């Protein structure tokens, strides 16, 4: 707030890939849908993905969007990306939620 503005909201179950056990796991520990924002830090022209579980408001994801990021729209409702530290997945609750977020993500990547 003050420093950033949200540029989208989308309904998704946020998951992270467990490389060691070759499975997706729920981000933050609990399975459930979250409200996932992309937030724009207006001053630096930087963007960050932040999500909070609907039920308890726990932040399950808070990861910058780096320049050049490769965003994989594997399916119409499941998109994923990586960093040096994690692989992230968004299991969106509809195709509308996916295109809203995907659309927001692509704009940010074009603007970085």
């Amino acid at each position: 707030s003050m420093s950033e503005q949200s540029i989208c909201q989308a309904r998704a179950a946020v998951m992270v890939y467990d490389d060691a056990n070759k499975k997706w796991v729920p981000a933050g520990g609990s399975t459930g849908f979250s409200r996932v924002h992309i937030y724009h830090h207006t001053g630096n022209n930087t963007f960050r993905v932040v999500g909070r579980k609907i039920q308890d408001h726990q932040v399950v994801i808070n990861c910058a969007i780096p320049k050049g990021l490769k965003y994989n729209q594997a399916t119409q409702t499941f998109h994923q990306w990586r960093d040096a530290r994690q692989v992230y997945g968004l299991n969106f609750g509809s195709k509308e939620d996916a295109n809203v977020f995907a659309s927001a993500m692509m704009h940010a990547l074009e603007v970085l």
């Binding site: 997706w24 594997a74 499941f78 994923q80 692989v87 299991n91």
Partner: peptide, 6 residues
Amino acid sequence: XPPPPX
């Protein structure tokens, strides 16, 4: 990019 969850 690992395959989706299910």
